[PDB]
Amino acid sequence: KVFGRCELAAAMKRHGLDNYRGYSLGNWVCAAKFESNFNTQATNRNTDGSTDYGILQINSRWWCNDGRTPGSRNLCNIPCSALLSSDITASVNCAKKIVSDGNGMNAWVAWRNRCKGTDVQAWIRGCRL
Ligand SMILES: [Cl-]
Ligand SMILES: [Cl-]
Ligand SMILES: [Cl-]
Ligand SMILES: [Cl-]
Ligand SMILES: [Cl-]
Ligand SMILES: [Cl-]
Ligand SMILES: [Cl-]
Ligand SMILES: [Cl-]
């Protein structure tokens, strides 16, 4: 599924991501924009052989199981395929664990490089939330 901007904001709010760990909804929308362009089906291989999955590009090195990332863990206790669903529940639940892991949203290097410090409220501007 390819979400619209306000549509994804609303879905993230509905699943409790709004201000989770102190990160406003615009931060989460911004991250999703630059990680996946709002496409739940996005996958990308990393150089090290792990893969990033879904709307927030969660990595199989730590967070989900894909059967092909030796030495990796599955800390969200989920198949990585679950992170590609139209329903964003599994990706939000896992993102909540990631952002609680100690470095906040710096875990998403596209958030750190493209969102952090910017006018992230622009991402929810105009949205009926
Ligand atoms: Cl957009
Ligand atoms: Cl915001
Ligand atoms: Cl992989
Ligand atoms: Cl997804
Ligand atoms: Cl594996
Ligand atoms: Cl392994
Ligand atoms: Cl959803
Ligand atoms: Cl980046």
Side-chain angles (χ1 to χ4, degrees), residues 38-77:
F38 306 148
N39 185 351
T40 69
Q41 299 194 76
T43 60
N44 288 295
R45 196 78 185 253
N46 306 127
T47 61
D48 73 355
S50 59
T51 297
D52 289 351
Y53 293 87
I55 190 77
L56 285 163
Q57 290 292 278
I58 289 173
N59 192 339
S60 63
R61 172 60 188 80
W62 293 105
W63 303 111
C64 63
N65 176 52
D66 68 7
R68 61 168 203 197
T69 304
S72 73
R73 304 281 293 283
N74 179 11
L75 296 169
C76 296
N77 304 301

mmCIF file of all heavy atoms in Angstrom, residues 38-77:
data_model
loop_
_atom_site.group_PDB
_atom_site.id
_atom_site.type_symbol
_atom_site.label_atom_id
_atom_site.label_comp_id
_atom_site.label_asym_id
_atom_site.label_seq_id
_atom_site.Cartn_x
_atom_site.Cartn_y
_atom_site.Cartn_z
ATOM 1 N N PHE A 38 6.517 6.102 1.810
ATOM 2 C CA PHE A 38 5.176 5.744 2.241
ATOM 3 C C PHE A 38 4.658 4.473 1.654
ATOM 4 O O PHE A 38 3.449 4.147 1.807
ATOM 5 C CB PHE A 38 4.122 6.883 2.015
ATOM 6 C CG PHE A 38 4.471 8.184 2.610
ATOM 7 C CD1 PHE A 38 4.022 9.360 1.919
ATOM 8 C CD2 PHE A 38 5.074 8.388 3.842
ATOM 9 C CE1 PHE A 38 4.254 10.604 2.451
ATOM 10 C CE2 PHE A 38 5.285 9.589 4.360
ATOM 11 C CZ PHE A 38 4.838 10.769 3.703
ATOM 12 N N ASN A 39 5.553 3.586 1.176
ATOM 13 C CA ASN A 39 5.168 2.335 0.554
ATOM 14 C C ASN A 39 5.376 1.191 1.554
ATOM 15 O O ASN A 39 6.558 0.896 1.925
ATOM 16 C CB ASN A 39 5.980 2.135 -0.707
ATOM 17 C CG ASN A 39 5.577 0.901 -1.505
ATOM 18 O OD1 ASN A 39 4.794 0.082 -1.067
ATOM 19 N ND2 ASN A 39 6.055 0.872 -2.794
ATOM 20 N N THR A 40 4.319 0.576 2.032
ATOM 21 C CA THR A 40 4.480 -0.572 2.946
ATOM 22 C C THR A 40 5.229 -1.703 2.365
ATOM 23 O O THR A 40 5.741 -2.549 3.172
ATOM 24 C CB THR A 40 3.076 -1.089 3.411
ATOM 25 O OG1 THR A 40 2.406 -1.679 2.335
ATOM 26 C CG2 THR A 40 2.248 -0.038 4.069
ATOM 27 N N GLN A 41 5.340 -1.887 1.070
ATOM 28 C CA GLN A 41 5.987 -3.032 0.483
ATOM 29 C C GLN A 41 7.469 -2.819 0.241
ATOM 30 O O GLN A 41 8.097 -3.767 -0.261
ATOM 31 C CB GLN A 41 5.297 -3.510 -0.816
ATOM 32 C CG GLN A 41 3.857 -3.935 -0.565
ATOM 33 C CD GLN A 41 3.305 -4.691 -1.721
ATOM 34 O OE1 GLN A 41 3.597 -5.822 -1.945
ATOM 35 N NE2 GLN A 41 2.531 -3.979 -2.580
ATOM 36 N N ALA A 42 8.017 -1.668 0.583
ATOM 37 C CA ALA A 42 9.433 -1.369 0.293
ATOM 38 C C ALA A 42 10.420 -2.397 0.953
ATOM 39 O O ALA A 42 10.272 -2.633 2.165
ATOM 40 C CB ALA A 42 9.775 0.027 0.813
ATOM 41 N N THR A 43 11.338 -2.898 0.181
ATOM 42 C CA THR A 43 12.420 -3.720 0.819
ATOM 43 C C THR A 43 13.714 -3.210 0.203
ATOM 44 O O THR A 43 13.790 -2.908 -0.985
ATOM 45 C CB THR A 43 12.246 -5.226 0.411
ATOM 46 O OG1 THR A 43 12.322 -5.459 -0.991
ATOM 47 C CG2 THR A 43 11.033 -5.796 1.009
ATOM 48 N N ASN A 44 14.823 -3.267 0.995
ATOM 49 C CA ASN A 44 16.117 -2.899 0.486
ATOM 50 C C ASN A 44 17.217 -3.727 1.168
ATOM 51 O O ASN A 44 17.280 -3.765 2.381
ATOM 52 C CB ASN A 44 16.401 -1.446 0.748
ATOM 53 C CG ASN A 44 15.519 -0.557 -0.172
ATOM 54 O OD1 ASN A 44 15.658 -0.564 -1.404
ATOM 55 N ND2 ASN A 44 14.549 0.070 0.409
ATOM 56 N N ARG A 45 18.043 -4.333 0.341
ATOM 57 C CA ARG A 45 19.167 -5.161 0.899
ATOM 58 C C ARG A 45 20.220 -4.174 1.357
ATOM 59 O O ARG A 45 20.454 -3.114 0.777
ATOM 60 C CB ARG A 45 19.772 -6.053 -0.197
ATOM 61 C CG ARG A 45 20.703 -7.266 0.318
ATOM 62 C CD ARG A 45 19.790 -8.282 0.779
ATOM 63 N NE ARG A 45 20.363 -9.454 1.405
ATOM 64 C CZ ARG A 45 20.440 -10.671 0.890
ATOM 65 N NH1 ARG A 45 20.075 -10.980 -0.343
ATOM 66 N NH2 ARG A 45 20.907 -11.613 1.645
ATOM 67 N N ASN A 46 20.848 -4.542 2.449
ATOM 68 C CA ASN A 46 22.040 -3.864 2.927
ATOM 69 C C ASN A 46 23.312 -4.585 2.485
ATOM 70 O O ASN A 46 23.275 -5.780 2.201
ATOM 71 C CB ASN A 46 21.986 -3.747 4.456
ATOM 72 C CG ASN A 46 20.704 -3.101 4.973
ATOM 73 O OD1 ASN A 46 19.964 -3.642 5.862
ATOM 74 N ND2 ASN A 46 20.406 -1.981 4.410
ATOM 75 N N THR A 47 24.419 -3.884 2.458
ATOM 76 C CA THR A 47 25.715 -4.408 2.029
ATOM 77 C C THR A 47 26.154 -5.650 2.756
ATOM 78 O O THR A 47 26.828 -6.574 2.212
ATOM 79 C CB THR A 47 26.816 -3.250 2.032
ATOM 80 O OG1 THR A 47 26.981 -2.715 3.347
ATOM 81 C CG2 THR A 47 26.342 -2.208 1.242
ATOM 82 N N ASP A 48 25.764 -5.666 4.017
ATOM 83 C CA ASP A 48 26.101 -6.780 4.915
ATOM 84 C C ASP A 48 25.251 -8.037 4.848
ATOM 85 O O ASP A 48 25.442 -9.003 5.612
ATOM 86 C CB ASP A 48 26.104 -6.272 6.372
ATOM 87 C CG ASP A 48 24.695 -5.985 6.960
ATOM 88 O OD1 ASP A 48 23.645 -6.065 6.310
ATOM 89 O OD2 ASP A 48 24.640 -5.525 8.082
ATOM 90 N N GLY A 49 24.251 -8.006 3.978
ATOM 91 C CA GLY A 49 23.356 -9.125 3.661
ATOM 92 C C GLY A 49 22.041 -9.076 4.403
ATOM 93 O O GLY A 49 21.194 -9.879 4.076
ATOM 94 N N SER A 50 21.910 -8.186 5.410
ATOM 95 C CA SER A 50 20.582 -8.007 6.040
ATOM 96 C C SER A 50 19.630 -7.225 5.034
ATOM 97 O O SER A 50 20.164 -6.748 4.046
ATOM 98 C CB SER A 50 20.656 -7.175 7.333
ATOM 99 O OG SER A 50 21.208 -5.867 7.125
ATOM 100 N N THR A 51 18.379 -7.166 5.417
ATOM 101 C CA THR A 51 17.390 -6.405 4.517
ATOM 102 C C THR A 51 16.626 -5.579 5.416
ATOM 103 O O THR A 51 16.269 -5.948 6.552
ATOM 104 C CB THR A 51 16.553 -7.463 3.773
ATOM 105 O OG1 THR A 51 17.415 -8.206 2.955
ATOM 106 C CG2 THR A 51 15.506 -6.809 2.775
ATOM 107 N N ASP A 52 16.162 -4.391 4.894
ATOM 108 C CA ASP A 52 15.250 -3.488 5.582
ATOM 109 C C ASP A 52 13.810 -3.606 4.968
ATOM 110 O O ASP A 52 13.698 -3.752 3.708
ATOM 111 C CB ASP A 52 15.700 -2.036 5.384
ATOM 112 C CG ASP A 52 16.951 -1.672 6.136
ATOM 113 O OD1 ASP A 52 17.451 -2.442 6.972
ATOM 114 O OD2 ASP A 52 17.427 -0.569 5.859
ATOM 115 N N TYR A 53 12.802 -3.641 5.819
ATOM 116 C CA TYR A 53 11.442 -3.974 5.414
ATOM 117 C C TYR A 53 10.444 -2.935 5.867
ATOM 118 O O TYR A 53 10.350 -2.513 7.001
ATOM 119 C CB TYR A 53 11.044 -5.314 6.086
ATOM 120 C CG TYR A 53 11.815 -6.496 5.603
ATOM 121 C CD1 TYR A 53 13.087 -6.841 6.220
ATOM 122 C CD2 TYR A 53 11.380 -7.273 4.562
ATOM 123 C CE1 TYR A 53 13.776 -7.901 5.765
ATOM 124 C CE2 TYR A 53 12.090 -8.387 4.129
ATOM 125 C CZ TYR A 53 13.341 -8.702 4.776
ATOM 126 O OH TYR A 53 14.015 -9.785 4.284
ATOM 127 N N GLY A 54 9.599 -2.538 4.854
ATOM 128 C CA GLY A 54 8.334 -1.837 5.184
ATOM 129 C C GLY A 54 8.502 -0.334 5.290
ATOM 130 O O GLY A 54 9.496 0.275 4.913
ATOM 131 N N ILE A 55 7.403 0.219 5.772
ATOM 132 C CA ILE A 55 7.163 1.656 5.822
ATOM 133 C C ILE A 55 8.303 2.397 6.600
ATOM 134 O O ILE A 55 8.705 3.555 6.281
ATOM 135 C CB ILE A 55 5.756 1.797 6.470
ATOM 136 C CG1 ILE A 55 5.213 3.212 6.398
ATOM 137 C CG2 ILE A 55 5.749 1.460 7.931
ATOM 138 C CD1 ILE A 55 4.685 3.577 5.034
ATOM 139 N N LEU A 56 8.882 1.705 7.609
ATOM 140 C CA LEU A 56 9.970 2.280 8.400
ATOM 141 C C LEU A 56 11.316 1.515 8.203
ATOM 142 O O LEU A 56 12.278 1.689 9.000
ATOM 143 C CB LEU A 56 9.614 2.410 9.896
ATOM 144 C CG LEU A 56 8.639 3.602 10.112
ATOM 145 C CD1 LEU A 56 8.000 3.409 11.531
ATOM 146 C CD2 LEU A 56 9.345 4.949 10.008
ATOM 147 N N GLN A 57 11.369 0.672 7.187
ATOM 148 C CA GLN A 57 12.662 0.023 6.784
ATOM 149 C C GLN A 57 13.397 -0.649 8.013
ATOM 150 O O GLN A 57 14.570 -0.358 8.266
ATOM 151 C CB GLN A 57 13.574 1.051 6.039
ATOM 152 C CG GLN A 57 12.987 1.393 4.654
ATOM 153 C CD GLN A 57 13.056 0.178 3.751
ATOM 154 O OE1 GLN A 57 14.148 -0.045 3.185
ATOM 155 N NE2 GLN A 57 11.983 -0.612 3.572
ATOM 156 N N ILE A 58 12.611 -1.463 8.663
ATOM 157 C CA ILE A 58 13.196 -2.173 9.858
ATOM 158 C C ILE A 58 14.067 -3.302 9.382
ATOM 159 O O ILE A 58 13.768 -4.103 8.521
ATOM 160 C CB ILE A 58 11.992 -2.621 10.629
ATOM 161 C CG1 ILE A 58 11.290 -1.363 11.275
ATOM 162 C CG2 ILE A 58 12.444 -3.653 11.721
ATOM 163 C CD1 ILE A 58 9.996 -1.718 11.909
ATOM 164 N N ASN A 59 15.244 -3.401 10.084
ATOM 165 C CA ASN A 59 16.372 -4.267 9.600
ATOM 166 C C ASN A 59 16.326 -5.675 10.192
ATOM 167 O O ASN A 59 16.206 -5.810 11.428
ATOM 168 C CB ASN A 59 17.679 -3.497 9.927
ATOM 169 C CG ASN A 59 18.944 -4.042 9.288
ATOM 170 O OD1 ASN A 59 19.011 -5.208 8.886
ATOM 171 N ND2 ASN A 59 20.055 -3.254 9.366
ATOM 172 N N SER A 60 16.510 -6.646 9.364
ATOM 173 C CA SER A 60 16.542 -8.042 9.772
ATOM 174 C C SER A 60 17.834 -8.436 10.625
ATOM 175 O O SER A 60 17.848 -9.510 11.119
ATOM 176 C CB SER A 60 16.560 -8.923 8.516
ATOM 177 O OG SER A 60 17.677 -8.745 7.750
ATOM 178 N N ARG A 61 18.826 -7.546 10.680
ATOM 179 C CA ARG A 61 20.115 -7.819 11.458
ATOM 180 C C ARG A 61 19.648 -7.920 12.887
ATOM 181 O O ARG A 61 20.292 -8.692 13.574
ATOM 182 C CB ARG A 61 21.039 -6.561 11.262
ATOM 183 C CG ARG A 61 22.310 -6.531 12.108
ATOM 184 C CD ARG A 61 23.097 -7.648 11.811
ATOM 185 N NE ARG A 61 24.264 -7.806 12.732
ATOM 186 C CZ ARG A 61 24.268 -8.322 13.983
ATOM 187 N NH1 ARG A 61 23.170 -8.826 14.566
ATOM 188 N NH2 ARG A 61 25.392 -8.347 14.657
ATOM 189 N N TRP A 62 18.659 -7.163 13.392
ATOM 190 C CA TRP A 62 18.217 -7.148 14.824
ATOM 191 C C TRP A 62 16.805 -7.477 15.107
ATOM 192 O O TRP A 62 16.426 -8.027 16.155
ATOM 193 C CB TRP A 62 18.428 -5.792 15.480
ATOM 194 C CG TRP A 62 19.882 -5.535 15.588
ATOM 195 C CD1 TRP A 62 20.609 -4.688 14.813
ATOM 196 C CD2 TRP A 62 20.803 -6.173 16.507
ATOM 197 N NE1 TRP A 62 21.950 -4.763 15.176
ATOM 198 C CE2 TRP A 62 22.069 -5.642 16.239
ATOM 199 C CE3 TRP A 62 20.652 -7.148 17.513
ATOM 200 C CZ2 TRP A 62 23.194 -6.033 16.949
ATOM 201 C CZ3 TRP A 62 21.844 -7.586 18.274
ATOM 202 C CH2 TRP A 62 23.070 -7.011 17.968
ATOM 203 N N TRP A 63 15.885 -7.042 14.198
ATOM 204 C CA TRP A 63 14.516 -6.838 14.643
ATOM 205 C C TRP A 63 13.521 -7.836 14.156
ATOM 206 O O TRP A 63 12.487 -7.976 14.794
ATOM 207 C CB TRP A 63 14.041 -5.377 14.214
ATOM 208 C CG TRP A 63 14.981 -4.370 14.793
ATOM 209 C CD1 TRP A 63 15.877 -3.573 14.084
ATOM 210 C CD2 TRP A 63 15.164 -4.055 16.158
ATOM 211 N NE1 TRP A 63 16.616 -2.768 14.959
ATOM 212 C CE2 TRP A 63 16.183 -3.056 16.224
ATOM 213 C CE3 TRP A 63 14.497 -4.468 17.339
ATOM 214 C CZ2 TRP A 63 16.617 -2.508 17.459
ATOM 215 C CZ3 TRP A 63 14.941 -3.901 18.592
ATOM 216 C CH2 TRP A 63 15.996 -2.980 18.605
ATOM 217 N N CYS A 64 13.715 -8.442 13.010
ATOM 218 C CA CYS A 64 12.749 -9.391 12.490
ATOM 219 C C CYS A 64 13.468 -10.562 11.867
ATOM 220 O O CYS A 64 14.681 -10.463 11.546
ATOM 221 C CB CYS A 64 11.763 -8.711 11.478
ATOM 222 S SG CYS A 64 12.634 -8.042 9.968
ATOM 223 N N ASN A 65 12.721 -11.659 11.665
ATOM 224 C CA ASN A 65 13.354 -12.829 11.071
ATOM 225 C C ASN A 65 12.991 -12.916 9.537
ATOM 226 O O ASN A 65 11.806 -13.013 9.213
ATOM 227 C CB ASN A 65 12.888 -14.148 11.754
ATOM 228 C CG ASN A 65 13.517 -15.344 11.013
ATOM 229 O OD1 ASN A 65 14.760 -15.367 10.814
ATOM 230 N ND2 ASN A 65 12.664 -16.216 10.404
ATOM 231 N N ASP A 66 14.013 -13.055 8.715
ATOM 232 C CA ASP A 66 13.831 -13.325 7.300
ATOM 233 C C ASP A 66 14.501 -14.622 6.838
ATOM 234 O O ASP A 66 14.401 -14.965 5.675
ATOM 235 C CB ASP A 66 14.202 -12.134 6.386
ATOM 236 C CG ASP A 66 15.629 -11.781 6.329
ATOM 237 O OD1 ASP A 66 16.527 -12.559 6.929
ATOM 238 O OD2 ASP A 66 16.030 -10.786 5.705
ATOM 239 N N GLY A 67 15.107 -15.389 7.793
ATOM 240 C CA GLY A 67 15.732 -16.659 7.395
ATOM 241 C C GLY A 67 17.005 -16.544 6.616
ATOM 242 O O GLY A 67 17.589 -17.592 6.260
ATOM 243 N N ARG A 68 17.465 -15.344 6.250
ATOM 244 C CA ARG A 68 18.630 -15.289 5.425
ATOM 245 C C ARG A 68 19.669 -14.290 5.962
ATOM 246 O O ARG A 68 20.435 -13.763 5.180
ATOM 247 C CB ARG A 68 18.273 -14.989 3.962
ATOM 248 C CG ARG A 68 17.576 -13.653 3.747
ATOM 249 C CD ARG A 68 17.538 -13.348 2.257
ATOM 250 N NE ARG A 68 17.411 -11.970 2.040
ATOM 251 C CZ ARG A 68 17.014 -11.410 0.852
ATOM 252 N NH1 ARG A 68 16.769 -12.233 -0.131
ATOM 253 N NH2 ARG A 68 16.971 -10.064 0.726
ATOM 254 N N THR A 69 19.641 -13.921 7.243
ATOM 255 C CA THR A 69 20.547 -12.944 7.733
ATOM 256 C C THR A 69 21.367 -13.691 8.933
ATOM 257 O O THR A 69 20.988 -13.573 10.085
ATOM 258 C CB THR A 69 19.801 -11.733 8.338
ATOM 259 O OG1 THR A 69 18.894 -11.213 7.274
ATOM 260 C CG2 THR A 69 20.708 -10.634 8.631
ATOM 261 N N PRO A 70 22.434 -14.338 8.531
ATOM 262 C CA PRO A 70 23.148 -15.139 9.535
ATOM 263 C C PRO A 70 23.533 -14.278 10.633
ATOM 264 O O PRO A 70 24.244 -13.356 10.374
ATOM 265 C CB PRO A 70 24.430 -15.540 8.775
ATOM 266 C CG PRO A 70 24.018 -15.629 7.376
ATOM 267 C CD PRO A 70 22.925 -14.619 7.160
ATOM 268 N N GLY A 71 23.332 -14.817 11.900
ATOM 269 C CA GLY A 71 24.001 -14.242 13.051
ATOM 270 C C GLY A 71 23.072 -13.213 13.580
ATOM 271 O O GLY A 71 23.427 -12.564 14.585
ATOM 272 N N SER A 72 21.946 -12.918 12.868
ATOM 273 C CA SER A 72 21.077 -11.849 13.272
ATOM 274 C C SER A 72 20.137 -12.210 14.414
ATOM 275 O O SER A 72 20.139 -13.414 14.801
ATOM 276 C CB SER A 72 20.239 -11.488 12.083
ATOM 277 O OG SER A 72 19.218 -12.457 11.780
ATOM 278 N N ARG A 73 19.466 -11.244 15.023
ATOM 279 C CA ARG A 73 18.436 -11.548 15.988
ATOM 280 C C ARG A 73 17.068 -11.167 15.391
ATOM 281 O O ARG A 73 16.993 -10.675 14.198
ATOM 282 C CB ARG A 73 18.642 -10.660 17.289
ATOM 283 C CG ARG A 73 20.065 -10.908 17.836
ATOM 284 C CD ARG A 73 20.135 -12.301 18.676
ATOM 285 N NE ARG A 73 19.338 -12.219 19.910
ATOM 286 C CZ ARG A 73 19.734 -11.587 21.007
ATOM 287 N NH1 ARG A 73 20.970 -11.081 21.039
ATOM 288 N NH2 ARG A 73 18.922 -11.453 22.083
ATOM 289 N N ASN A 74 15.983 -11.333 16.175
ATOM 290 C CA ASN A 74 14.538 -11.196 15.850
ATOM 291 C C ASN A 74 13.910 -10.580 17.136
ATOM 292 O O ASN A 74 12.969 -11.150 17.738
ATOM 293 C CB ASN A 74 13.902 -12.501 15.426
ATOM 294 C CG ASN A 74 12.363 -12.324 15.110
ATOM 295 O OD1 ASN A 74 11.876 -11.207 15.028
ATOM 296 N ND2 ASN A 74 11.617 -13.447 15.056
ATOM 297 N N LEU A 75 14.314 -9.372 17.472
ATOM 298 C CA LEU A 75 13.892 -8.798 18.720
ATOM 299 C C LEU A 75 12.417 -8.375 18.770
ATOM 300 O O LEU A 75 11.810 -8.269 19.816
ATOM 301 C CB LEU A 75 14.821 -7.675 19.173
ATOM 302 C CG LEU A 75 16.249 -8.132 19.490
ATOM 303 C CD1 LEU A 75 17.117 -6.900 19.669
ATOM 304 C CD2 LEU A 75 16.335 -9.114 20.694
ATOM 305 N N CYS A 76 11.829 -8.129 17.579
ATOM 306 C CA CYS A 76 10.392 -7.874 17.542
ATOM 307 C C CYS A 76 9.580 -9.133 17.500
ATOM 308 O O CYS A 76 8.319 -9.016 17.498
ATOM 309 C CB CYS A 76 9.980 -6.876 16.349
ATOM 310 S SG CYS A 76 10.759 -5.263 16.706
ATOM 311 N N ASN A 77 10.238 -10.313 17.406
ATOM 312 C CA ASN A 77 9.499 -11.575 17.363
ATOM 313 C C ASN A 77 8.445 -11.634 16.268
ATOM 314 O O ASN A 77 7.280 -11.950 16.517
ATOM 315 C CB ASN A 77 8.837 -11.844 18.702
ATOM 316 C CG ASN A 77 9.876 -11.839 19.822
ATOM 317 O OD1 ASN A 77 10.821 -12.641 19.795
ATOM 318 N ND2 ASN A 77 9.777 -10.853 20.730
#
